C-alpha cells in the first residue's frame, strides 16, 4: 500500500519531532515553574 | 478506504504524541 | 518519500522559528 509506506515513514519522522519537543518542553517548564515557585515561596516567607 | 484509514491514523498519532506534552505541562502547572 | 521528508522538515522549521517567539514572550511575561 502506498499509504502504508507513507504512514511508516511518518512514524519515524514523528519520533524525531516529539524527541525535539520533549527536550525543549522539559527545560522551559523547569524554568517557568521554578520562577513561579520562587515568587510564591518568597511572598509566603513574607 | 486505504488512504482514509492511514490518513486518519496519522491524525490520531499526532494528537497522541502532542497530548502527552499538553497533559504533562497542565498537570505540573496546576500542581504548583 | 522525498516530498514527505521535505514537507515534514518544513513543518518542524515552522514550529522551531515560532516557538522561539512563544518561549521568549512567556518567560519574560511570568518573569515580571
Amino acid at each position: 500500500d502506498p499509504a502504508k509506506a507513507a504512514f511508516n515513514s511518518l512514524q519515524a519522522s514523528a519520533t524525531e519531532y516529539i524527541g525535539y519537543a520533549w527536550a525543549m518542553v522539559v527545560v522551559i517548564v523547569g524554568a517557568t515553574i521554578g520562577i513561579k515557585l520562587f515568587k510564591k515561596f518568597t511572598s509566603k516567607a513574607s | 478506504m486505504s488512504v482514509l484509514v492511514y490518513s486518519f491514523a496519522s491524525f490520531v498519532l499526532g494528537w497522541c504524541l502532542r497530548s502527552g506534552i499538553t497533559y504533562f505541562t497542565r498537570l505540573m502547572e496546576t500542581s504548583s | 518519500m522525498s516530498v514527505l521528508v521535505y514537507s515534514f522538515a518544513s513543518f518542524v522549521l515552522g514550529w522551531c522559528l515560532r516557538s522561539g517567539i512563544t518561549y521568549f514572550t512567556r518567560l519574560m511575561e511570568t518573569s515580571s
Binding site: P2, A3, A6, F7, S9, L10, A14 | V3, Y6, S7, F8, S10, F11, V12, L13, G14, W15, C16, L17, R18, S19, I21, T22, R26 | M1, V3, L4, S7, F8, F11, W15
Partner: peptide
C-alpha cells in the same frame, strides 16, 4: 510526470498535513 507519480506524491502530502492538524488539535488545552 505520470499519474502514479501524482498519486504517490498526493498521498505523502495528505499524511503529513493530517499529522500537522493532529499536533494543532492536540495542543489545544
Amino acid at each position: 510526470a505520470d499519474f502514479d507519480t501524482i498519486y504517490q506524491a498526493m498521498i505523502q502530502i495528505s499524511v503529513v498535513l493530517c499529522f500537522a492538524l493532529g499536533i494543532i488539535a492536540g495542543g489545544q488545552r
